[PDB]
Every structure is written in C-alpha cells, then in structure tokens.
C-alpha cells in the first residue's frame, strides 16, 4: 500500500541534510557560464582562473545562504513558514543592500 511522508517532513529532513553538509549546491558548469556571460557583458575576451570562478561561487553561495537565513526570519516574523519575495526585500532593505 502506497506510502507518503507528510508535507514538510522531507523539508526538515532536507534542512538537516544540507546544514550538516559543506558542498556547493549550484551546478558547477551552469554557474561558470553565468560568470562568463556576465563578465563578457562588462569586458570582452576575458579568461578566468578555474580558482577564480570557484572563489566567486563560494562567495555567491555563501551570500545566498546568508540571505535566505534573514529571509526566513522575516517570514517567521510575519507569522508564516513560507518565504516570499516580500521577505527577501525586507531583509535586503534592512541589510542596507538596496533600501
């Protein structure tokens, strides 16, 4: 007989998993293309040290995870458990990033 984890159970599982973890969470190549695109729109004919592309990813994923923490706090603050774009915006406004 078919068996289902209740909604929100795999999420908690997923949190405990990824926080215990240390690995990059964005795919290596899709991100590198993004980097080479954005860069190229600012300057052409650019080469990148494989380490420089990694350094950027490390920083970016660091940033986004940090950002999602604060986001999740504004969601809870608003008596919700679901993050919304409104929450990201409050986080960023207060972080001073662009108020």
């Amino acid at each position: 007989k078919p068996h289902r984890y209740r909604p929100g159970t795999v999420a908690l599982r997923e949190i405990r998993r990824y926080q215990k973890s240390t690995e990059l969470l964005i795919r290596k190549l899709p991100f590198q293309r993004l980097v080479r695109e954005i860069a190229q729109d600012f300057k052409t004919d650019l080469r990148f040290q494989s380490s420089a592309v990694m350094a950027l990813q490390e920083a970016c994923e660091a940033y986004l995870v940090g950002l999602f923490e604060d986001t999740n706090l504004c969601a809870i603050h608003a008596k919700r458990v679901t993050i919304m774009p409104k929450d990201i915006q409050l986080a960023r406004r207060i972080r001073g990033e662009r108020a």
Binding site: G8, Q19, T22, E58, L73, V81
Partner: protein
C-alpha cells in the same frame, strides 16, 4: 652566534619576516623593535586559540585531519572568534546546524 629573534622572544611565528612586512607595508616610516615581536606574538596566540578549538571539532567529528568545516565549527561556535570574523567567509565551511523552533512539528 645564530640566535633568531623568534626564539629570542619565545615564539613560533617569525619575528624577522613580520618586521620586514611592517617596514615594507606603508604603515609608517620607522618600525619599532618590539612591534614585530608583539604582533608575531598576537598572531601566534590567535592561530593557537583557533587551532585548538578546531582540533576538538575534528576529533568530535571522528577525524584526524582538520578540514575547513572544522575551522568553521570552531569559529562560529565561539562567541568571541565569531565576532572577530563576523564578516569573513570560509570557503568549504558550511553553516552551523540551526532550525527555527516554530518549524518543527508536534
């Protein structure tokens, strides 16, 4: 005879090199004798403070060699180190396990 300044101060960190880095760093025109010693000492103290805390983490986590995760556990769990490196990102560090209470089921 050979005696090194590092050993003359009872330090592992290299008082010599740190005196040169000061002189060569556009910090001031003349560098005092004790400045590189005092700094080598402080840099040495902190290195140890972090390293001991990190070593515990590596051992608490079953392992014999300290990796980045460990330094991150060591730093983010120490209220004072954590303030010292509040703006610092440790590659391959991960995050401290933390789940808001309102999120657990009952």
């Amino acid at each position: 005879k050979s005696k090194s300044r590092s050993s003359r101060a009872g330090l592992q960190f290299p008082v010599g090199r740190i005196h040169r880095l000061l002189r060569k760093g556009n910090y001031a025109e003349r560098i005092g004798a004790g400045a590189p010693v005092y700094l080598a000492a402080v840099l040495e103290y902190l290195t140890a403070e972090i390293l001991e805390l990190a070593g515990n983490a590596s051992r608490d986590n079953k392992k014999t060699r300290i990796i980045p995760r460990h330094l991150q556990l060591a730093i983010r769990n120490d209220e004072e180190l954590n303030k010292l490196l509040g703006g610092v990102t440790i590659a391959q560090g991960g995050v401290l396990p933390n789940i808001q209470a309102v999120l657990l089921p009952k």
